[PDB]
Design a protein around this nucleic acid. Structure first.
Ligand SMILES: [Mg+2]
Ligand SMILES: [Mg+2]
Length: 338
RNA sequence: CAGGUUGUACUUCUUAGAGGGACUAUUGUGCAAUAAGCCAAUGGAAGUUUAAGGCAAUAACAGGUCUGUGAUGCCCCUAGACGU
């Protein structure tokens, strides 16, 4: 057997409610570690984390700055390439541009109506993409001006849950055969793929229930898609009649993340976090349910927390799961190969 | 520590418009024949129907009001008038 076992790293706490979004630093000079962690939660707060080198006590790190601009929950965060800037989606019908050194909000994006579930940052950093319960995807100048809004003929029924982008690698030698696209996942169970011009390129009806999250392989060759359908769908951008691969992950799918290198898929689920190996065909490579540190409070027992977010650090060695109890948990992997 | 001034300044305090927010939320081998519900702890600005009120069905009670009304039936007073 190839055993992939998990060493517990630590605990990042001080998030009052849920942990809805997590981003880790971009690798700046190549193959070097990311010092930076940012989370977003219900709690009305965006947390900036100063991370311990080793692990002291049971903790992996300590809260540095708490960004407060927001009325309702923070749905999703995205980083600039600079790593010096972050953005916040919210149910408060607004987006925010955050300087990461100062607590300062730079500009805020206004003009969304209902509420905002997700945001994406384009590789050029001059385009912001935002989506919400308006069944609408919006394109913003970094100066805070709505540039475009996808219309009825294209846009999908119910709510856009998540929008993301299609990475173009640095070297041209990294083999980019396709066109640039952006992907939109929704509560109608539709995975959409649009060109830069906001023209529908490929819209497949992926799921039977609703889709909470979508992420793109670092290669931009495949898409991972998931929600209440209790199914993890992987799609080849070459042949779409049939989904590339499918996995059964217990109960409901909250989040999905690709290992920036390692070629695994981590899935946030109510039961816990599952990790899939794409290099072999088997259905459950590493499974983590987490008992509650808040349960250690005497007399109150948990049903377990459910994990509301995932992120990998740039090196792909560390993994962060945001939870129901407002605690981020950190885990590392040791390989024992028989 | 106090005044006086000031600005392509600002919203914590102050107005008060928009919109949030609480649904008994979360947890509970707590009581419930596990159903309505109650209870506790935690979080929470707020968990006594959040608090205090407005409105008030069917029916009555020959309740009160001709002295609130230029709403009136009938009765009475009409030039030393019960009129002004
Ligand atoms: Mg009342
Ligand atoms: Mg009488």
């Amino acid at each position: 057997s190839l055993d992939i076992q998990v060493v517990k790293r630590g605990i990042l706490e001080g998030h009052s409610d849920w942990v809805t979004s997590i981003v880790a630093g971009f690798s700046q000079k190549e193959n070097e570690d990311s010092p930076v962690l940012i989370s977003g939660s219900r709690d009305k707060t965006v947390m900036i984390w100063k991370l311990y080198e080793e692990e002291q006590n049971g903790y992996f790190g300590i809260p540095h700055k708490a960004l407060t601009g927001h009325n309702h929950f923070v749905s999703d965060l995205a980083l600039s390439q600079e790593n010096c800037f972050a953005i916040s989606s919210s149910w408060d019908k607004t987006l925010r541009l955050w300087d990461l050194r100062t607590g300062t909000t730079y500009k805020r994006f206004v003009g969304h109506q209902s509420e905002v579930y997700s945001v994406a940052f384009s590789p050029d950093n001059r385009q912001i993409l935002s989506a919400g319960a308006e069944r609408e995807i919006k394109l913003w100048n970094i100066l805070g001006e709505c540039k475009f809004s996808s219309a009825e003929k294209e846009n999908h029924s119910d709510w856009v849950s998540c929008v993301r982008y299609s990475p173009i690698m640095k070297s041209a030698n990294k083999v980019q055969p396709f066109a640039p696209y952006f992907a939109s996942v929704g509560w109608d169970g539709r995975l959409k793929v649009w060109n830069t011009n906001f023209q529908i390129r490929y819209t497949f009806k992926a799921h039977e229930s609703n889709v909470n999250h979508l992420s793109i392989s670092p290669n931009g060759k495949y898409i991972a898609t998931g929600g209440k359908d209790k199914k993890l769908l992987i799609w080849d951008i070459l042949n779409l009649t049939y989904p590339q691969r499918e996995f059964d992950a217990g109960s409901t799918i909250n989040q999905i993340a690709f290992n920036p290198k390692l070629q695994w898929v981590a899935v946030g689920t109510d039961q816990g976090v599952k990790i899939f190996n794409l290099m072999t065909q088997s259905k459950a490579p590493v499974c983590t349910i987490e008992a509650e540190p808040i349960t250690k409070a005497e007399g109150q027992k948990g049903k377990n927390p459910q994990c509301t977010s995932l992120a990998w650090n740039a090196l792909g060695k560390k993994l962060f799961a945001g939870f129901t109890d407002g605690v981020i948990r950190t885990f590392s992997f040791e390989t024992s190969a028989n």
